[PDB]
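request received
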Amino acid sequence: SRYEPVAEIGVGAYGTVYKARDPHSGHFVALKSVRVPNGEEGLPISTVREVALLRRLEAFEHPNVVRLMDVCATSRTDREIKVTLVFEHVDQDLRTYLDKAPPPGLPAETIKDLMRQFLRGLDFLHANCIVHRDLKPENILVTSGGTVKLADFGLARIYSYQMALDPVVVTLWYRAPEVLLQSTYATPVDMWSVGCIFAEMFRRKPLFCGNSEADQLGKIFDLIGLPPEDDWVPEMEESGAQLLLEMLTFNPHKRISAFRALQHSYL
Amino acid sequence: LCCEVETIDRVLRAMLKAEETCAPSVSYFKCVQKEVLPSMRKIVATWMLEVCEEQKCEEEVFPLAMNYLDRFLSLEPVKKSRLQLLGATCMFVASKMKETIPLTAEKLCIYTDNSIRPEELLQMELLLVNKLKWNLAAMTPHDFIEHFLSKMPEAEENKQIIRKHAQTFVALCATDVKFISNPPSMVAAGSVVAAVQGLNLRSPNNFLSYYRLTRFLSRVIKCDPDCLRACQEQIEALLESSLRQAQQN
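response:
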């Protein structure tokens, strides 16, 4: 498989993602690249281990996560190796799905369904010890047929080196409060992003928006209310907003999980 | 693979799926290799095992590195002069995957008497990973052994003895062509079977899981119970030729 471009689907957080065609499968694919340091021991171990762990997911054939189907270290210098990641292509994200969705909802059973695949997908990820960390409506892809597929999970550590040279473009409206370290950087971080996606499906704009960490972290307390120590206008069903808060529980250790969430009255 | 609950066998089913994606070809010496022969594979494999033993590697390193070796050999013809280079690169990648402190490119070359060199190893590593498509997180017989063991009403003192014998059988298989024909699950099962049986034979009221273990693991594995049987007997045969590797000198 030598892959050949066919579009430039986006140039977000992890560089330029090209759409390419598999020349014997005929299927489309979403390519991304990453620069890695070529050490004295060859390939950086964390890259090998993390990339390998993503490659293995595909075995589970889970319907709510994009398969990483191929990897190639293409270039190579005494300081760097360039690795392209070959993902299953999904032509639209959650945005485009929410933008071409006429006034006003709509509807709930469809939002419930989305949320239900989203938590299934995430539960899968989390179980296999993979945290997304950068969950976005862009990361949330939607097939024609309504299957939500999670993408760009488990690339945080793979992209660490490249991103430290040097952006930093931090679209921050969904980041868990923790991510603004201290400290972790654990699994719950994705459930905060879930709830922020949760709300915005009934809303139509990212609650907690732009500005810096402090402005971002401030706009969170506005709706959740400041967390006394030591903690350091719904449009959906009443039951819906119940789950949402549980997700938006500023504290990780008693914030709802993707499995506990799945087992909620609202579902 | 750590669920958040206890409502969430589902694990084992996953292990079985993964292993299918990392199977070598049974006919690669015929259809792919022109120089490399099974007795050379044996040679490189026994080299690789002595290195892991000498270095006290994590048990999984040797079987994982052979999976790599058989897999590559399924995809690329290799010159017999490059085989040792391949085996060392397989160990290098397998160590990175499974060890807290992996083997260094240099230390591996030392074991080749410096017949190969680090830059050679570093260049092979990229070839190997790329060819396996970075699907390096393969199952080993050790994965299944420990899984089976967790299902068995054996006292931990029993389990540890079983574990020791079964890991011996695995290393034996990995040097043999059988490792090519049989998935890690099969290999782990034959070795567990051969282990629990031999043990029980010398301790009749102990290691009671020996009874119909083949069918049992067959059901757990979802393999053919006569395939497991053949496998085990191939393992017992292979051990009975371990007194020729003991007196090959």
